[PDB]
Design a protein around this ligand. Structure first.
Ligand SMILES: Nc1ncnc2c1ncn2[C@@H]1O[C@H](COP(=O)(O)OP(=O)(O)OP(=O)(O)O)[C@@H](O)[C@H]1O
Ligand SMILES: Nc1ncnc2c1ncn2[C@@H]1O[C@H](COP(=O)(O)OP(=O)(O)OP(=O)(O)O)[C@@H](O)[C@H]1O
Ligand SMILES: Nc1ncnc2c1ncn2[C@@H]1O[C@H](COP(=O)(O)OP(=O)(O)OP(=O)(O)O)[C@@H](O)[C@H]1O
Ligand SMILES: Nc1ncnc2c1ncn2[C@@H]1O[C@H](COP(=O)(O)OP(=O)(O)OP(=O)(O)O)[C@@H](O)[C@H]1O
Ligand SMILES: Nc1ncnc2c1ncn2[C@@H]1O[C@H](COP(=O)(O)OP(=O)(O)O)[C@@H](O)[C@H]1O
Lengths: 42, 529, 40, 415, 107
């Protein structure tokens, strides 16, 4: 009879995971360092 | 705090005792002695039976009794998934905690229960569809490898419930994986009594049950009622009793002050039995009223003889031990009224399971279907302590036609093989068959299978005809005397089923023309003895 | 598909977030170098 | 604010009374007395019958009568899907809210409703079939496990609909499951009167119904009219009345009803008037006594089958030389019968059929014949049905066996 | 407006008048009286005849007559698909706009 299923196989992995990745936390510290050396130069 | 009476299961003492002995006997005896024996523990139970007998209730109650972790549950095929390799991890996720605790706490660990529900949906025989459907060959392998593999577990217990014990894989039922196998069947009188007491205790506690209701009569009356149908009966009786106090359901719902004086009387039980609940392996009064359409009347000597010969056969099949299977063939000329006599004999047998296999319900069926339906009716009869199965119009069942001749061979072989298959040890069976042509059955070598034969005659004398007319009483005194004067000095040859139609046809003329028309018809029919 | 479509759209918005964060860090480092050079 | 009159249902008093007695009689009694009995609640209802008799209407009215939440609807086989393991997920998504609310609250929870439509397109018998297409077994097993499983649910109610009560699995129709089975059949005179009153109430209110139309006459002139054809009759009458005002004093008169009854509505279980025009092509001519004799005998047989109680089934064979005029006389007898249901089963509408198709057609005609207080069926030119030919001989055995079985089968009680 | 001839169909005199009378008589009459009566609208019609005699043309013309939206032409043989639950999905896609628009705009 015309009745058959199917199964899928996934080609899914791309740009790193959502912001649970370390990109944002990494970005955080640079601004603090900028503040520090701005102080020193002034 | 466990106590058996709190369980609330009735009629299953032997099964529970066996399960307790085989499964939980070695986890309660003092450990020091059990160590000196070096015996492992049982890790499986299987339950099977027909619908509505008390499997899931037993599983739930066993789950509640153990002071251990909360049981896991799997509702049917809850584990399947659409991504390759994701329908197996769900199998492995069930044993992880048990594995970890066995690794950590050694031999003092707890007990982890698992309950597979409808296990015949994911554990069918391997290699049955050219490697199965692709996802029913990996799941089975994973389950087999996990239950008993290279690494040893000693703190699990798996339970299974299924209606079809034939399709489960064979490698999964050996004495190392699912050792205990139990069949849950219908109860006998004591079981019904226990079930009714269990389900009526609460009502009797608060004096909501009348005093004219006697449980023993109800137990005797309900023959071959499954477990759930007794509960259904009680519920229907309660609902019918409660419906009295809602007066204006049509307009607006209102409840009276007499709700306090609420009581359930036997009339509700009788009404519920008559109208609402209908069993599955029992019997009901519609079929008899459909076959015996005009009762039975004693118009002569032969009827009593036939009934006596039926009674003797019934008594023999009830008492004897050497012969658990007996059969008899009722035969006679057409329009003689033989199926009614067979129905009467079966009804007066008073056996629990009585079913009629008639061609009225096989219109348009091919041979394969007739054969399979016959097999099912004859299989249902192997699951009762007593039975009686009636076969009707053996001629029409074979599709026999005088030309050629032409008929079906597969059905005939099925019948010839099915009259010599003894039931499972300890049960009895009686088969009655009816036919209108003995010689044709003789030519097929089919009178050797039957054990005994009975003959059914016609009306063959004027006095018997007069007695039949008097019993029916359609013609009054004067017309009866005229008929007697006409026919008393001759011989007649007519059947009862034809006599009724002749009378009905004759009655439609004018009031003064009935007797002559009836005599004309009776002359026209012809004798040819 | 609406579920997957919308979630992938949020993922694209998140890609924009990541790009903004990276560019901001790079610009901060450039200004960093400029000031550090200036002091001498 | 609920009361029976506003439901808009007529002719189904006893069925609704029984449904109310068995399903809802324990959800309105004071809870204190209910708890002292410790009785669970019924969990299902099933409704079956011929088309156009008022099942979906009853289900809708039940759904919107209660103080429950919005009833979920399943429109036939809309749960099937092509990926392994998706149908069961769709089945499982229906019961989630009930389980969550039960766990959170306990005995104080509200009520939920699920309404399956055309249930017989999913739950077929779980036979072996050498291994069924999973479409049947997996879905049925999931549904069975969800309705009544290890965990207890006590705040659901499931309703079903179907035209074929034979195909559904037996394990799904036991107490504790869909256990209230009801049959919705054609109405009798009181039912037709109630339906006509229900469907012509608004017109009467605004004085649009002429004073000459008498409903009691229409209740008699329509025999074996289903529930769904009376509405069609009324609508056709209204449309005919309205079209007359296209080239404020609009009104509906008897002539519109008569015209619409004669030309627009054609009942399926009623008598047809074109068949007799097609088979009796040149009337009947009295050229001697034999015609009168035959007609008188037919009249006597009809009267017998109408007035007796020990002979509910009658038969007769008309036979003679060829080119003699048998079909016309049979049709004339049937027409003069004056029975609500008359039919003809001729062999010229089965050109090219095989044996099994002919068997099915005959069985279908007789099944319909078994649903009316009276009937009359004509089987003409039998030797064509059997497929007879002298060389050989040759013929069909299946059709002959079917006919021989059907010639002595009694209808349900009282018909 | 009927004018069977102006629309572009000739020879359909009665098979148009009967259609208009029976089916479409409750769409053009003033809404007040229709609502007062309380009669629903016909839900479809059936056309059968020899091929090439002008059926689809009549359907499109009827659609244009009532200021209806664009019709959704469907071919019978094209709906069947060999997987489980594909034909039903196709049959169930045609009734989306009606459901959505009724749910939004009411009556
Ligand atoms: N021995 C028994 N004593 C008391 N009640 C019983 C017994 N057996 C069955 N019942 C009643 O049957 C009801 C449902 O039965 P149960 O859940 O055991 O069905 P089952 O036959 O195992 O299920 P299924 O055949 O549908 O897979 C229980 O709630 C209980 O009321
Ligand atoms: N003493 C009797 N014996 C048998 N039938 C009787 C008797 N008295 C009345 N009847 C009525 O006679 C009818 C018997 O018909 P039944 O069904 O037995 O026919 P049959 O012999 O099996 O027919 P067939 O040979 O044509 O298949 C039933 O209505 C039964 O009620
Ligand atoms: N008993 C009745 N009283 C009043 N009106 C009725 C009754 N039965 C049917 N009708 C009218 O006829 C219509 C028939 O539609 P309904 O949905 O009830 O049909 P059905 O027989 O359940 O459907 P189907 O055969 O397609 O499954 C109802 O909507 C209502 O308009
Ligand atoms: N008294 C009559 N009896 C029968 N038919 C008559 C009579 N008077 C006229 N006719 C016409 O005779 C024709 C009846 O022929 P009909 O089809 O019944 O024959 P038939 O016996 O079925 O034929 P065949 O078996 O030879 O094919 C119809 O035209 C009917 O109008
Ligand atoms: N009554 C008619 N008057 C004028 N042209 C017609 C008529 N009926 C059919 N036609 C012509 O036939 C052509 C195709 O008809 P079509 O819609 O294919 O009919 P069908 O539904 O049978 O396929 C149209 O383009 C039209 O010009």
């Amino acid at each position: 009879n015309p009745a058959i299923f199917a199964s899928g196989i996934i080609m899914d992995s791309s740009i790193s995971k959502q912001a649970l990745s370390e990109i944002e936390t990494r970005h955080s510290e640079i601004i603090k360092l900028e503040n520090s050396i701005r102080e020193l130069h002034d | 705090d466990w106590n058996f009476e709190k369980m609330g299961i009735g009629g299953l003492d032997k099964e529970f005792s066996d399960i307790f002995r085989r499964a939980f006997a070695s986890r309660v005896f003092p450990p020091e002695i059990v160590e000196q024996m070096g015996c492992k523990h049982v890790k499986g139970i299987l339950l099977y039976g027909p619908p509505g007998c008390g499997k899931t209730l037993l599983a739930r109650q066993i789950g509640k009794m153990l002071n251990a972790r909360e049981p896991k549950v799997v509702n049917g095929p809850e584990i399947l998934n659409k991504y390759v390799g994701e329908s197996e991890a769900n199998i492995r996720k069930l044993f992880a905690d048990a594995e970890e605790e066995q690794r950590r706490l050694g031999a003092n660990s707890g007990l982890h229960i698992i309950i597979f529900d409808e296990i015949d949906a994911i554990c069918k025989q391997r290699g049955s569809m050219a490697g199965s459907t692709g996802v029913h060959d990996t799941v089975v392998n994973q389950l087999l490898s996990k239950i008993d593999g290279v690494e040893q577990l000693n703190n699990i217990l798996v339970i299974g419930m299924t209606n079809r014990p034939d399709l489960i894989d064979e490698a999964l039922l050996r004495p190392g994986r699912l050792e205990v196998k139990m069949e849950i069947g219908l109860p006998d009188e004591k079981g019904r009594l226990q079930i009714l007491h269990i389900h009526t205790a609460r009502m009797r506690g608060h004096q909501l049950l009348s005093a004219d209701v006697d449980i023993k009569e109800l137990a005797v009356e309900t023959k071959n009622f499954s477990g759930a149908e007794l509960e259904g009966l009680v519920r229907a009786a309660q609902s019918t009793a409660m419906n009295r106090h809602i007066k204006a359901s049509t307009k607006v719902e209102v409840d009276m002050e007499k709700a306090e004086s609420l009581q359930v009387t036997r009339g509700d039980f009788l009404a519920s039995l008559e109208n609402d609940i209908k069993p599955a392996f029992g019997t009901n009064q519609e079929d008899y009223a459909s076959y015996i359409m005009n009762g039975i009347i004693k118009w002569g000597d032969p009827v009593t003889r036939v009934l006596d010969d039926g009674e003797l056969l019934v008594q023999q099949t009830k008492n004897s031990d050497r012969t658990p299977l007996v059969s008899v063939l009722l035969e006679g000329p057409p329009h003689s009224g033989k199926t009614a006599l067979a129905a009467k004999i079966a009804e007066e047998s008073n056996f629990p399971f009585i079913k009629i296999c008639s061609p009225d319900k096989m219109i348009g069926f091919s041979e394969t279907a007739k054969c399979q339906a016959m097999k099912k009716i004859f299989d249902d009869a192997y699951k009762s302590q007593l039975s009686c199965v009636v076969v009707d119009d053996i001629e029409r069942l074979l599709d026999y036609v005088p030309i050629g001749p032409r008929f079906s061979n597969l059905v005939l072989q099925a019948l010839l093989v099915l009259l010599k298959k003894a039931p499972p040890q300890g049960r009895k069976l009686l088969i009655i068959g009816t036919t209108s042509r003995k010689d044709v059955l003789q030519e097929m070598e089919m009178l050797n299978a039957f054990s005994t034969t009975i003959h059914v005659p016609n009306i063959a004398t004027g006095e018997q005809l007069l007695e039949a007319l008097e019993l029916l009483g359609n013609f009054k005194d004067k017309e009866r005397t005229t008929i007697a004067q006409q026919v008393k000095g001759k011989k007649v040859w007519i059947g009862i089923k034809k006599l009724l139609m002749l009378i009905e046809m004759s009655l439609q003329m004018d009031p003064e023309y009935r007797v002559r028309k009836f005599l004309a018809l009776l002359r026209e029919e012809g004798a040819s003895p | 598909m609406a579920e997957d479509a919308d979630m992938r759209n949020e993922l694209e918005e998140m890609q924009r977030r990541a790009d903004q964060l990276a560019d901001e860090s790079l610009e901060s480092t450039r200004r960093m170098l400029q000031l550090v050079e200036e002091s001498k």
